[PDB]
Amino acid sequence: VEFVREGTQFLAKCKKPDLKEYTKIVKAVGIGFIAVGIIGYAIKLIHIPIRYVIV
């Protein structure tokens, strides 16, 4: 029961980010993830008819 108490004390000692930086963080990470995912999706999609016609 001491481990959860130490964890609670530690998280109370950590720093929770407020909204003003949370919005920038989530914006940056979402932009990056969407930018890589859309590229991947388009690349996998376009290559299917090309692979069919070529081979």
Binding site: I46, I48, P49, I50, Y52, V53, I54
Partner: protein, 485 residues
């Protein structure tokens, strides 16, 4: 496996529907969710020449079309009528097995073989050839070679700097037919307010381009630790932006409507704006020889609005990185002298907080910008600027790159406090409208860039803050740091 294309055209419509919806939605939502007084912004275009106006003039439907296409495809879908697995794709049949079967692959291989490599190579070459400062490599090499074999015997003048600028490589790309001598002649005509006749469009271009070139030359000169060259560069920039040759009596020649053949012939003692403001209002017009009140008011208003500098308090600071702080008093050329003792000293004091101690430049970056300059002959519109440089006093060599400041409050120049005139001479300090807390005092913070010397004693320094657009009075002070440990 092996999929089956849509030959009934039943599956791709909804795919295009969602594809356009996912892009229109957030864009429409974003579209739905979506300090410093300037007095010359009107008067500048009032005296600008017509040719310069013509030169400066010469030199969202995606949403609605997406909505239209959405409506069209929605109506097309609504017009439509409609154990083992059967895999299939949403792509139509004609686009993969019709008469346009090789078209897709040939345009694809074309776009992947010729479009991407050529463009990426062009972009890489363009980004690589240019320097980080913002100039070409050939011009930087030429500047360095010129400063390398520079005899200290030759005294720097304006013509020498113009001749050095005449070899700019970026001018050759603009006009591959012209010559450096032609550039020098054009710049001489511009400074002397002479007409090129036919190459006015090129003279304007090179005049507009010389700005970044001069800033790069200043940076390189400060790099080589040479003071005279930097000072001459500042003077040349002043002469270029004001379109006037450098003369001892130039602070009055930069005025809009003056006649040299009359002014120089009449008087020989007026060289600053204070000496001119010492005279009467009609005396000023009678001296300048303009005899036009409707135009005299304009020149008086433009002459009584350029900023003069004056120190209030300067001292060293020794944090982990030593940096100097300045207390500057921006005043006009008409207001009399105020004693420094009248300052409440509160603006001189600084608040000591954790955030302020971490980055002292934060409060400095809060000051507003400076308004647009008054350049009746410069092609484009420019803002005021102030570049500061620091050197040693033992030998006389520049010790760091120049810092250029842009944020400043010109509140003390507004037409509100016009009662504070010099010709009144009735001790306007004891006035009913005199409020010592109304006068704002800007601040300037300059880092040393180098660690403090390990020795003990007094070590003298010298900081200069010159103008970049006008010919006002600047600062030249010498301070010494007293390392004591």
């Amino acid at each position: 496996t092996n999929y089956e294309y849509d030959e009934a055209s039943e599956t791709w419509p909804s795919f295009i529907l969602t594809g356009l919806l996912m892009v229109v939605g957030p864009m429409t939502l974003l579209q739905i969710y979506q300090f410093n007084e300037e007095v010359f912004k009107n008067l500048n275009e009032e005296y600008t020449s017509d040719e310069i106006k013509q030169f400066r003039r010469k030199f969202n439907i995606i949403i609605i079309v997406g909505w239209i296409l959405v409506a069209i495809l929605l109506q097309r879908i609504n017009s439509n009528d409609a154990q083992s697995t059967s895999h299939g794709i949403a792509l139509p049949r004609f686009l993969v097995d019709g008469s346009a079967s090789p078209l897709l692959v040939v345009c694809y291989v074309a776009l992947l073989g010729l479009i991407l490599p050529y463009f990426v190579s062009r972009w890489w070459a363009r980004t690589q050839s240019y320097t980080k400062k913002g100039i070409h490599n050939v011009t930087a090499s030429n500047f360095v070679s010129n400063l390398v074999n520079y005899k200290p015997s030759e005294i720097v003048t304006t013509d020498l700097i113009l001749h050095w600028l005449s070899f700019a490589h970026e001018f050759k790309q603009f006009f591959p037919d012209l010559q450096p001598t032609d550039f020098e002649k054009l710049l001489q005509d511009h400074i002397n307010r002479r007409d090129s006749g036919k190459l006015n469009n090129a003279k304007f271009r090179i005049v507009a381009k010389c700005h970044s070139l001069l800033h790069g030359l200043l940076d390189i000169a400060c790099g080589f630790r040479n003071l005279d060259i930097a000072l001459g560069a500042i003077n040349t920039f002043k002469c270029i932006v004001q379109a006037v040759p450098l003369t001892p009596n130039c602070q009055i020649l930069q005025l809009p409507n003056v006649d040299k053949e009359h002014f120089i012939t009449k008087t020989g003692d007026i060289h600053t704006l204070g000496k001119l403001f010492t005279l009467e209002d009609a005396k000023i017009g009678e001296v300048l020889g303009i005899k036009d009140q409707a135009k005299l008011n304009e020149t008086l208003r433009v002459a009584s609005h350029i900023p003069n500098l004056k120190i209030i308090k300067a001292d060293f600071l020794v944090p982990g990185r030593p940096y100097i702080s300045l207390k500057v008093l921006v005043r006009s050329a008409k207001q009399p002298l105020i004693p420094t003792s009248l300052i409440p000293e509160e603006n001189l004091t600084e608040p000591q907080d954790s955030e302020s101690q971490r980055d002292p430049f934060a409060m400095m970056s809060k000051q507003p910008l400076v308004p647009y300059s008054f350049a009746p002959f410069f092609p484009t519109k420019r803002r005021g600027s102030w570049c500061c440089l620091v050197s040693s006093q033992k030998d006389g060599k520049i010790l760091q790159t120049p810092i250029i400041i842009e944020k400043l409050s010109y509140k003390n120049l507004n037409d509100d406090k016009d009662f504070f005139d010099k010709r009144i001479k009735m001790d306007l300090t004891k006035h009913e409208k005199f409020d010592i807390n109304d006068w704002e005092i800007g601040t300037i913070k300059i880092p040393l860039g180098q660690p403090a010397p390990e020795t003990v004693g007094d070590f003298f320094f010298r900081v200069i803050v010159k103008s970049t657009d006008y010919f006002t009075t600047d600062l030249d002070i010498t301070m010494n740091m007293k390392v004591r440990d």
